[PDB]
DNA sequence: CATGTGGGAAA
RNA sequence: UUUAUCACCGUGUCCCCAAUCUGGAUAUUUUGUGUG
């Protein structure tokens, strides 16, 4: 679904990194407010680190080299082909799309 | 013999002189051309300021001077602008006033003054811009106050290009007998200059003349040059057919041509034939460009 | 034999030549073309002013002169504009009338100036506009409170383009009594044009030499041309069919073209064959106006 | 007498001074040059801090000192900055201003320090970079679980090159009132500096001795050199022209030729002919500096 | 879009308030009883909003406006309609530039 | 209802621009007749130049961008979005109201 | 021709997997995670390391294709293999 | 004449 | 509801301007265990 794929992969990446750093399954946070505070702090730290990392480099080959390597998209078993074939304007636009998606997720 | 054109080159070096600004900690560099690549520029008024600073340095009396004061950029003017004064850099400027006294200090000179006898143009990096950047970390935080800067430290970025660049300039022989020594001092400043770059302590390079390839003519301020060289500097090929037969076949004359550093190239067989028409036996740009002053000027 | 059609273009160079106005601190430029892109133009009256200035440069009497005086834009108008004015009034310009005094200025001349022998049209950038700008300056204040200008130190912008543009022109050959003395000055002036810009202190730009395609026919003002070159500037593709059948196949004859600077293109084979029809020999455009002006004129 | 242009001296050895950060656990080095290859660089500000430390170890009263404290990169600024400071601030530095308190620091000097007497430039590896790398690190884990570090034990990468690099710099004379006592120590520090790299526990690198071709004349800050050696350190690509010249005819006028570690190269006969006019009698760069510092100064 | 117009206004005012709160640790909750605090509060608001307005008005272009908007501005939190609003944005942007100019310029304090 | 807010916008623009440019207000103007004369003539000049500037460039983008000037006076709190949408769509009656409001101040 | 890269990557990964009921699922999940070590080694390459329907034609043609846009190939093995796990 | 909000995916 | 008719003639948007002043990505680390 094009942009929805970018949104999903960004959200999955941030969740996967948060799970690798700290215990997953946020529903266990439950009532203890300090757990919410520390969870939000770690979330925003990871998100703004990625935000800076993608912001400082948005120029053609380096951008994609950092984007594909450090992010884990969905499978897109056969629908990915169209996503790959139009890669030039795809990158030219998904720089802004990825920046917007990353900026969307702050506490 | 009433007009002078010229173009000059510089040695390759890392770039400097950021102009634009951005919150992203990146000091951007001005760019113009879109032919599939990008180039860097240096605006001419900055070089005009450098020329004013150098005429300050050499012993010429002038009425404009820059002062370090309250954070608003300011320059005092003292005496009123006047054509008949030792000042020539202070001569160029024109400024209006709501009052403008009583008919411009009672009919003494005239306020709106011509640009100058000197005209210039922007520079072009003649090398495509590259996305390389340099990364540095600036800590600003003190443990004993002493009127510290912002509380939190930061990490910043710059960018730099290893290139050399050129720019043209020209002047007219309308009024020269009135300012012989002024034109001499201006030419001496042009022969070698300093600054023109924002970053002194970092990325230092000066616009040493690498080649001068033009002379005067009574052609009434008209030219033929495209004002652009190749990467290696041996541009004369595009003018080779223009210079080899300067004497005949309705070709531009021999008197219009010069040589700077490119003349010192290892091949010298054709230098013999070009010497038969043009005066280009000069290897050091400073001596040649000083000798040009006597021929161009009345004295 | 009685008509002359031609188009003139220029070398590429960064050119601002600001004309518009805006409080937005960006000196806008004029755009007229609508194909999804913007093209810069130069209005013809500026070229007319430059032509008047160059006629002033050579010995040519005139009745209109620009004076530098009080802030209102003014002209010193001197004598009555008579049709028998040697250079300016006869060649172009008009004699306006509000009251037309008494008995038609003592029954002299005619206040209806209908003919403007120099016909001119605007130029087209033939290069799409780019939204690039230059952050070239910040206004700064005075510190000694002498002739104090605007209170604060403002900031603004400017934009430039790297472009080369062409314009058409035409004139009808009718008179031969007074024109031959003055027409020769016009042709010489056209070969060399100097000015046609806002301020040459920055981005001084000149468009003197490039390929030219003059055409003289007894066709009573008729042109097969389109008044447009390519991005590279090889407009001559349309004449490829025209040149082949000069002798036969019911198509225009051998004396049907003139040459310019573009002849110095690398290929030579068809230039040898095209020589059999047209006068494609002049490598220097300035030399072209020396000869074909004679043929078009009486001598 | 008032200007000093100098060159650089280094030895080949494995590299250090990483700046980049790759998530793939590699310490990437900085590359800026684009001629089909990569080159290693070191920012001049690193060398500026190294010179500050070199002045620190010698007896020099300063206001800036580095401290190891809370994880923010902090710098101990001591008392309020002084422009007549005995070590650095006069020599090179700045006095900050966020609001600049009241009445210009209670009527004390001038806050912004425009001059940075030490004027240097970026370094260049002058040896093409290779993608050679080595992973010599297998990080560890805590076994007794007392104040443990990161739980996992990962694998990373490091890259170094066999290279020797140079960094052009120059300076001019400003005011001999306090110039000697600080500048003489500064020249000694230049002749012998340390660090300018984070990594010294591994890849210990120093660039103290090598050839120097420094150059000083009162030509008003003019540079004819290119600021670049060849692969094997033979600057002779210019020594044929600006060194063989004997300031007598048709040659550059010079009298301050200097040598370094290159004077002892295999050939010796031409050293005799250069000794007829040059001063390249120094095998030690230290001895050369000890004399040329006094020569450049008043005594 | 009128919904996206409200989004633009809300994100502009939120960015202004959040940047002021973070940069100069100042809260409007302390308004009552401290009129001098009101002067420096309005001064800081003037500075930040004037800088933002001049920066956004400085240049007009597709790529420049788009990437400045996505980089220097932090949009609000919404679940899905961002895809629709963004995709509608990318065909036409001039109206969005005018709307964000209106929202940002409406933030000037009175007198 | 938007006609009144447009008129108030124009009036506030004129008064604020004059006060910012040449530090003058109504009371000190009431002070002495010469100050009425000076302030009044300067107000005529500024409103006249604004009217001359706005009388041209009659289309969507040009009128919108010239509306970008004047710093969007007294737009205040955006309690109502209908002005942002419907009035931007109409883009014709707004020009007439703005011209009438500017001409009303002389 | 991106689908060709996807197919060859998937087929070769399954070939290595075959070379050497929740038990079946976890076995496949853990083994595919193991094979990822080979890919991080391959994606550490910069220019020069490690070099189905037909064999004769590809060497005659695809050999030229490999050497001109090798910069493109870096995304193929990285993007496609990661998409699997 | 002024500030507000969450959570998954595959041979 | 018929019949005929050039909106015509001229015009530099022009004159001055610097994105300026300072800034060590630093801190640690067995590719280790084997074999006709």
From TrEMBL, chains B, C, D:
It comes from the Bacteria. Keywords: Plasmid. This is Fruiting body developmental protein R-like protein. It comes from Synechocystis sp. (strain PCC 6714) (Aphanocapsa sp. (strain PCC 6714)).
Automatic annotation (TrEMBL), chain E:
Keywords: Plasmid. It comes from the Bacteria. This is Uncharacterized protein. It comes from Synechocystis sp. (strain PCC 6714). The chain holds residues 403 to 513 of 519 of the full protein.
Automatic annotation (TrEMBL), chain G:
It comes from Synechocystis sp. (strain PCC 6714) (Aphanocapsa sp. (strain PCC 6714)). This is Uncharacterized protein.
């Amino acid at each position: 679904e094009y942009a929805e794929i970018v949104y999903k992969i960004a959200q999955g990446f941030v969740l996967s990194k948060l799970s690798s750093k700290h215990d997953l399954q946020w529903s266990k946070c439950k009532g203890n407010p300090k757990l919410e505070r520390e969870y939000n702090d770690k979330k925003e730290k990871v998100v703004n680190e990625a935000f800076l990392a993608i912001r400082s480099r948005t120029e053609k080959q380096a951008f994609i080299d950092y984007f594909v390597s450090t992010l884990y998209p969905h499978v897109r078993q056969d629908e990915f082909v169209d996503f790959a074939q139009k890669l030039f304007q795809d990158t030219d636009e998904i720089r802004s799309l990825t920046l917007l998606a990353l900026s969307s997720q702050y506490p | 013999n009433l007009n002078l054109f010229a173009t000059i080159l510089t040695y390759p070096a890392p770039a400097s002189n950021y102009r634009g600004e951005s919150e992203e900690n990146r000091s951007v560099i001005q760019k113009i051309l879109k032919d599939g690549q990008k180039y860097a520029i240096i605006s001419p008024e900055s070089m005009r300021n450098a020329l004013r600073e150098m005429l300050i340095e050499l012993g010429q009396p002038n009425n404009r001077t820059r002062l370090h004061s309250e954070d608003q950029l300011a320059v005092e003017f003292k005496e009123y602008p006047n054509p008949d004064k030792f000042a020539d850099d202070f001569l160029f400027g024109y400024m209006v006033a709501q009052t403008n006294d009583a008919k411009e200090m009672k009919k003494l000179n005239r306020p709106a003054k011509r640009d100058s006898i000197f005209r210039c143009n922007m520079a072009v990096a003649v090398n495509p811009y590259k996305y390389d950047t340099v990364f540095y970390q600036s800590p600003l935080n003190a443990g004993d106050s002493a009127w510290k800067n912002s509380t939190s430290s930061a990490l910043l970025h710059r960018e730099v290009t290893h290139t050399a660049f050129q720019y043209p300039f020209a002047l007219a022989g309308k009024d020269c007998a009135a300012k012989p020594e002024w034109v001499k001092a201006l030419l001496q400043a042009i022969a070698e200059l300093n600054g023109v770059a924002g970053g002194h302590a970092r990325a230092y390079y000066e616009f040493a003349p690498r080649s001068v390839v033009a002379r005067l003519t009574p052609k009434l301020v008209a030219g033929y040059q495209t004002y652009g060289f190749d990467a290696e500097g041996n541009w004369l090929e595009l003018s080779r057919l223009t210079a080899t037969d300067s004497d005949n076949l309705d070709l531009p004359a021999n008197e219009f041509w010069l040589g700077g550093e490119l003349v010192r190239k290892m091949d010298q067989e054709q230098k013999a034939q070009l010497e038969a028409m043009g005066a280009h036996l000069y290897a050091n740009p400073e001596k040649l460009f000083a000798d040009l002053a006597d021929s161009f000027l009345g004295v």
